[PDB]
Design a protein around this nucleic acid. Structure first.
Length: 293
DNA sequence: TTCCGATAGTGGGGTCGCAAT
């Protein structure tokens, strides 16, 4: 009845791929954490910050899925309030409870929510803790593109990362949902822009010893020792109207080949790219290359 | 045959912990 691996959403690109009716909720820009005896991270590791871990373990019932987030604080702030091994943590913090696996991970989302709602009725005190504020994310029923778009405007105005779209009957898949499956979709609005290439960096093959991880997936260390330099581009430093940062994703095999092949004659060129504004500290967040010119 | 889920790989930004400076 436990959760093998956390549920992961798929990136929604075409608003047309959304199936209706569907239930939606706001996507928090916090840190994922599921309750399995104790509080675990997206990679099922224990939440470093013991105060939180311990606290949440007392309030949250076994099998709670949600995100830890410091209200008002920046992402980098919340990151620290969770990734640090605090002995004593006095500051306040919230936990957005959005899923609940009591027994069968095949129970329709709506029902899993119901199970979450019920638990609350029985333990109202959880939503009243003096420090930890537990926030139940009860989905909203969306019937068509129009309503959805309306919802996006709402959550966004309220300062959320985006919106999570789920299938009413959807199950708690132990893995990343697919577009077609439509179990859990992530809807984020990136922004277009352009920057000027100023330099390039070689691709690096991580030849570190291959092992297994908490879920049994290929895991390799990141020691520079086992980093062999490939003869192709890996990332490109660019100047976005003043600000400088790198872009290394969004390129295909042949592109990385060309870009590196003409590293010298490529400098100075203008390239398009998309990025997310929210969360950006000193440079664009999730920078993704799109094309040249 | 084509199509698609699942998976290894490679990339960004940014913080924590720890040894070295």
């Amino acid at each position: 009845m436990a959760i093998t691996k956390p549920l992961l959403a798929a990136t929604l690109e075409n608003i047309e791929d959304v199936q209706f009716p569907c239930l939606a909720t706001p996507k928090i820009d916090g840190i994922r954490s599921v309750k399995q005896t104790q509080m675990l991270s997206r990679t099922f590791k224990p939440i470093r910050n013991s105060v939180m871990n311990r606290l949440l373990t007392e309030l949250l019932p076994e099998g709670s899925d949600g995100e830890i987030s410091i209200e008002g604080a920046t992402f980098q702030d919340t990151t620290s309030a969770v990734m640090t091994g605090h002995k004593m943590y006095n500051a306040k913090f919230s936990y957005y409870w959005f899923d609940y696996v009591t027994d069968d991970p095949l129970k329709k989302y709506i029902d899993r929510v119901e199970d979450m709602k019920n638990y609350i009725t029985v333990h109202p005190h959880i939503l009243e803790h003096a420090q930890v504020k537990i926030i139940p994310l009860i989905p909203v029923e969306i019937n068509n593109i129009t309503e959805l778009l309306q919802y996006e405007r709402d959550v966004l105005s309220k300062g959320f990362e985006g919106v999570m779209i789920r299938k009413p009957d959807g199950k708690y898949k132990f893995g990343r949902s697919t577009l077609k499956e439509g179990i859990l979709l992530k809807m984020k609005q990136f922004k277009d822009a352009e920057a000027t290439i100023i330099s390039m960096t070689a691709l690096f093959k991580n030849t570190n010893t291959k092992t297994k991880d908490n879920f049994g997936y290929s895991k390799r260390s990141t020691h520079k020792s086992g980093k062999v330099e490939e003869d192709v581009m890996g990332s490109i430093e660019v100047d976005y109207d003043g600000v400088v940062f790198s872009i290394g994703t969004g390129f295909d095999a042949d592109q990385r080949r060309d870009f590196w092949q003409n590293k010298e004659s490529y400098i100075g060129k203008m390239v398009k790219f998309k990025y997310f504004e929210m969360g950006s500290k000193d440079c664009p967040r999730f920078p993704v290359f799109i094309g040249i010119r």
